């Protein structure tokens, strides 16, 4: 049983013929609500999907989760060669072509694909990420929801290079099994923007889950 998150070891990653470039269609993706869950920040969506790459069908977008740590240099779930990023976004997707809902897809072997976009604290103010950062005033208390009163295009939070690692693991809560698509190239944000998440209430200083052992029989693939 291979749990997530893991430390991806680059020397152990292997090739596969099906890892073409991943086509990401978020042109028709809009956000709906945004939540403080007591542990982390969730942003729900309606519309958008991913295709191409190694996927047989398309998987539609569900939600976005955001993770962070106590300090700026060390806050991601996943690691690459024992190196952590400042934070991590998890875009959840599910197989609508085969199955009738998200909670239905959570029970199947091939139900879920989670994309991982890393955050790195530089001195650039991310104009697209700010529109999420602004909404955090609504959801200060634990277990609160608010509507996303802001125009937002999800495409603009994609990294500049979409080379990727991919492995089978789980969801972060160990609810279900899921395929991961992890982009090593992080998007750049300011410390101000990330430190605003740390003012949320349960003070939520950090919410990353510690890594599990990469098993000897688990394969990690490079694109």
């Amino acid at each position: 049983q291979q749990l997530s998150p893991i430390n991806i070891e680059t020397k152990k990653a292997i090739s596969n013929a099906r890892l073409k470039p991943l086509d990401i269609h978020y042109n028709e993706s809009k956000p709906t609500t945004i939540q403080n869950t007591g542990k982390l920040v969730r942003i729900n969506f309606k519309g958008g999907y991913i295709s191409g790459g190694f996927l047989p069908n398309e998987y539609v977008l569900s939600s976005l989760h955001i993770y962070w740590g106590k300090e700026d240099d060390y806050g991601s779930n996943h690691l690459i060669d024992v190196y952590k990023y400042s934070g991590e976004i998890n875009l959840v997707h599910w197989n609508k072509k085969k199955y009738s809902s998200y909670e239905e897809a959570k029970k199947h072997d091939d139900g879920l694909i989670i994309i991982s976009i890393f955050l790195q604290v530089l001195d650039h103010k991310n104009v697209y990420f700010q529109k999420i950062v602004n909404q955090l005033d609504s959801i200060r208390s634990a277990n609160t929801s608010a509507p996303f009163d802001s125009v937002f295009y999800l495409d603009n939070l994609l990294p500049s290079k979409l080379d990727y690692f991919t492995y089978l693991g789980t969801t972060i809560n160990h609810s279900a099994d899921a395929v991961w698509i992890i982009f090593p190239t992080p998007i750049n944000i300011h410390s101000d923007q990330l430190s605003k998440f740390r003012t949320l209430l349960s003070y939520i200083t950090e919410n990353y889950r510690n890594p599990y052992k990469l098993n000897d029989d688990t394969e990690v693939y490079y694109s």
Epitope: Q1, Q2, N16, A17, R18, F54, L55, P56, K107, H108, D109, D110, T166, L168, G169, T170, D177, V179, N215, D217, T218, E219, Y221
Partner: antibody, heavy 122, light 111 residues
């Protein structure tokens, strides 16, 4: 790790063939693998019947989809085949085997059982 | 959704024998890998090649795998008498949504 089929040699025609594979030396509840049944009629080729994930999900051969059922029992480290409405074409050696999950499809059949002969006859 | 193999091949001991596995755009040509198995009479299939080219521990160096386009090939370089067996290519097929075996090739060692 070992796989071990268990089940009757003989089943009467138009009735349900029933087999059970028992895994030992390792756990069946692992998300890296599927658990498959394969058959070989005497002097003929291998045919994949179907496969099952630890948590329940099934994938069957579309030739035999309507007659085939597979199930798992993670508490007893075993999985089962039931094949209904059986004719002389279903007389075969039946193999249980562990194969690899590769992302969103299947890889190789790494370990196989001995095989058990089931004969269709009145 | 079919993998074609020639029904029989033969060679003398120490010769190079190849066995082809012709597939389609729904299996080999879609990048799903090809795996090979050896079967001695009355025993279970045994994994010989996986991921087009890889050998498990125990399989000797003379066994070899390749793939290009819609076709894949098992080569045996230096036939031994113990290599008399049935050989099966195997892959995944997207329209089947599951595993797919070829018809098999009976290998006879002459001489």
């Amino acid at each position: 790790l070992q796989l071990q089929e268990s089940g009757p040699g003989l089943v009467k025609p138009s009735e349900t063939l029933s087999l059970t594979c028992t895994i030992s030396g390792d756990s069946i509840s692992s998300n890296n693998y599927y658990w498959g049944w394969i058959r070989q009629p005497p002097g003929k080729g291998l045919e994949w019947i179907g496969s099952i994930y630890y948590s329940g999900s099934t994938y069957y051969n579309p030739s035999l989809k309507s007659r085939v059922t597979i199930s798992v029992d993670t508490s007893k480290n075993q999985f089962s085949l039931k094949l209904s409405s059986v004719t002389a074409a279903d007389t075969a050696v039946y193999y249980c085997a562990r194969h690899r999950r590769v992302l969103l499809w299947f890889g190789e059949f790494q370990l196989w059982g001995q095989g058990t002969l089931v004969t269709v006859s009145s | 959704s079919a993998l074609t193999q020639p029904p029989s091949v033969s060679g003398a001991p120490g010769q190079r024998v190849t066995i082809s596995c012709t597939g389609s755009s729904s299996n080999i040509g879609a990048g799903y890998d090809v795996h090979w198995y050896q079967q001695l009479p009355g025993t279970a299939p045994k994994l010989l090649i996986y991921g087009n080219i890889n050998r498990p521990s125990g399989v000797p160096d003379r066994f070899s795998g390749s793939k290009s386009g819609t076709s894949a090939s098992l080569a045996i370089t230096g036939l031994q008498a113990e290599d008399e067996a049935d050989y099966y290519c195997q892959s995944y097929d997207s329209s089947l949504s599951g595993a797919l075996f070829g018809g098999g090739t009976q290998l006879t060692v002459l001489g």
